[PDB]
Paper text:
The phospholipases are classified into four groups according to the cleavage site; phospholipase A1 (PLA1) cleaves sn-1 acyl chain, phospholipase A2 (PLA2) cleaves sn-2 acyl chain, phospholipase C (PLC) cleaves before the phosphate, and phospholipase D (PLD) cleaves after the phosphate. Here, we report the first molecular structures of plant PLA1s: [name] and CaPLA1 derived from [name] and Capsicum annuum, respectively. [name] and CaPLA1 are divided into the following two domains: the α/β hydrolase domain containing the lid domain, GXSXG motif, and catalytic triad and the C-terminal domain containing the dimerization domain. In addition to the conserved α/β hydrolase scaffold, GXSXG motif, and catalytic triad, plant PLA1s have an extended C-terminal domain composed of approximately 70 residues.
Author numbering:
A (entry chain B): 17 to 119, 122 to 158, 162 to 419
B (entry chain A): 14 to 119, 122 to 158, 161 to 419
Write the structure that this text describes.
């Protein structure tokens, strides 16, 4: 019952005052909960460029959280995924952001995240009907976050015509491919439309929007949240007087825009952003000049974990499961604060996509992989690469 | 299947007449027969844990129960109706390459490996294959240096008796076959005697039926298969204990075989009437030349040339010319090794199998390279939310009741 009673404070109503140093124990679990919904994006994203479905989702929407390990011992992850989101980019971006079959299912678009909503049981457990937008992040160079600023008037309107945004985040959020069934509408508007459907469906209940993302996903989650609140997409179409809170839990966030972006953000009453930042991770410094941060910061230091390989590197300091292990055991970032896991979070999760744990933990490095990389024996004895569950992504009946 | 082609021809398919008339060109039944036993050797690779970060590196992933279904040999394998009755473990008194004995970095054993299995047809398989077929499958080499195969000769009197005291065997094959570890529950008895005992149990169980022994192996497994077949026949272990006058045929289907012993080993082999060995040899694979000096080959040879496959990436390398699934692809489509013979698949064998442990197919085939792996490398969410490395099915390997 504790999360339901306190959810507005846990979602940042008072900017997490009193809840960060030391870390509030409910908030410790709350942050990990939304970080898991961002990691689920990595766990479904096909990164095998030898596959024709590289850059698509492995799993379909149906029973999605059960398929990525978020049902067992996750009594609060009672969400239904209602829509997958796809993105493209008019400019060239790193393969860590858009990755393609070495040939394919698409030449220019990737699966870029999903929209989900609590079912009736999850709504009871969380205190409110929670709409989650989870933006997929970076896959395995700090020069990848290399971008000049661009004017964002097409997002924030003539009334905010001085706002500028990183050209890469802008391009992934806003670009379309008229020839594509996936990105003929851009990632932005796919999200806005589906969030609008859910807000209208649940217009008579208490509702929240929580947006999740790591690395690239953190930038998109920050941009998405600011867009939604600034343009009033956190109101049901038929109830323009009912605003719902929009909170982003973001991890290892690069910066998103300039000082005018920060100014716009600072005037929005209904938005809150908690940026969890690992002190040895350098990606939150980029880009290193010209940009402003927005939101509240929560620092951790995974070098204090006795489970993590020392010294770490760019990958291990950045990786999202490393972050969530840091949240799980952080007792502060001062030299005297001693790391201690205060939730039952399996350390082995750290090694999904890195060699991050000490060898004595006995967990193989970079272990996440489909059985046989997806190759599967068929009923006629043939062997086919079955690394993609079919899902037309049609609107669900509601 | 309805005509029982294999049951009717099994003695010839198992080499009764040294495969005369069946190799050039390749007899169609024999094409499928060779692949059948090569799959039983490949099953040893498919269960062998090669992840040295695991405590169970060097052990079997799967248990004996429903073994062939677990390694993909049930669907569309109507003839693979075998029960695995015993796992076989080996050690070495001398240091050997990691491709032969592989150990955890840290572990379940410091000196032994899973080294193969013994299986037997069930009553349905016995009907389909024409006899009660006892299979010994020796596990082979894991992933490369041809010097890994270069050992000197040792006297093999402990195997073949003072009556054959001139026979010499490769020191490496001898050591893996014969070594024991007194402190190990796995190799306190050597791999040789584990196999002899279990084959003996099965011959005695089925003493009143028609029986065959077929021994399978690739690379290291091919050498052990050849050595164990010669041991078994030379020492009379192909007779049930209570019927010393009932010999059964011993046939070894081996793939990419290094040489095993010297000229006296070949002379011993030539005098055994009940043994047959068919060595399938890929011409661009250099391993069957090793060791190059001092050794003889035994048995009948069946050459193939996977360079003729339009499915295989060109040029190949040591690994792709040697790999067992490449060999079985070559068998599936060989029409001869002459320049003018054109490769053509004459069985429905999925080309994707080639890429289990190599990048062997042309990129146009759209099959990922080196694809064989457990889901999540065996990491598994448990019912209490913990995540544990579950890459080993428990099997105490106790004798089955028969």
């Amino acid at each position: 019952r504790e999360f339901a009673k306190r959810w507005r404070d846990l979602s940042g109503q008072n900017h997490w005052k009193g809840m960060l140093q030391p870390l509030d124990q409910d908030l410790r679990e709350y942050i990990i909960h939304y970080g898991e919904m961002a990691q689920a994006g990595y766990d479904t994203f096909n990164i095998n460029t030898e596959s024709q479905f590289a850059g698509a989702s492995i799993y379909s929407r149906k029973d999605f959280f059960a398929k990525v390990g978020l049902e067992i011992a996750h009594p609060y992850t009672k969400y239904k995924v209602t829509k997958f989101i796809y993105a493209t980019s008019d400019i060239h971006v790193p393969e860590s952001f858009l990755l393609f079959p070495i040939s394919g299912w698409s030449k220019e678009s990737n699966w870029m995240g999903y929209v989900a909503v609590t079912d009736d049981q999850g709504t009871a457990l969380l205190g409110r009907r929670d709409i989650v937008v989870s933006w997929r992040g970076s896959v395995q160079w700090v020069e990848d976050f290399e971008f000049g600023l661009v004017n964002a008037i097409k997002i924030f309107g003539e009334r905010n015509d001085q706002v500028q945004i990183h050209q890469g985040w802008y391009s992934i959020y806003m670009s379309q491919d008229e020839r594509s069934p996936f990105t003929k509408t851009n990632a932005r508007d796919q999200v806005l439309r589906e969030v609008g459907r859910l807000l209208e469906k649940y217009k008579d209940e208490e509702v929240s929007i929580t947006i999740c993302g790591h690395s690239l996903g953190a930038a998109l989650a920050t941009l998405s949240a600011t867009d939604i609140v600034a343009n009033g997409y956190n109101r049901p179409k038929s109830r323009p007087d009912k605003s719902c809170p929009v909170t982003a839990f973001v991890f290892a966030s690069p910066r998103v825009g300039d000082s005018d972006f920060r100014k716009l953000f600072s005037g929005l009453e209904d938005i809150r952003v908690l940026r969890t930042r690992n002190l040895p991770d350098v990606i939150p410094i980029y880009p290193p000049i010209g940009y402003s941060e927005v939101g509240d910061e929560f620092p951790i230091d995974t070098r204090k974990s006795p489970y993590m390989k020392s010294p770490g590197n760019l990958a291990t300091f950045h990786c999202l499961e490393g972050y969530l292990h840091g949240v799980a055991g952080t007792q502060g970032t001062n030299k005297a604060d001693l790391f201690r896991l205060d939730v039952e979070r399996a350390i082995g999760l750290v090694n999904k996509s890195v060699d991050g744990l000490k060898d004595e933990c006995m967990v193989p490095g970079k272990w996440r992989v489909l059985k046989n990389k997806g190759m599967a024996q068929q009923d006629d004895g043939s062997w086919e690469l079955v690394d993609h569950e079919i899902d037309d992504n049609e609107d669900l009946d509601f």
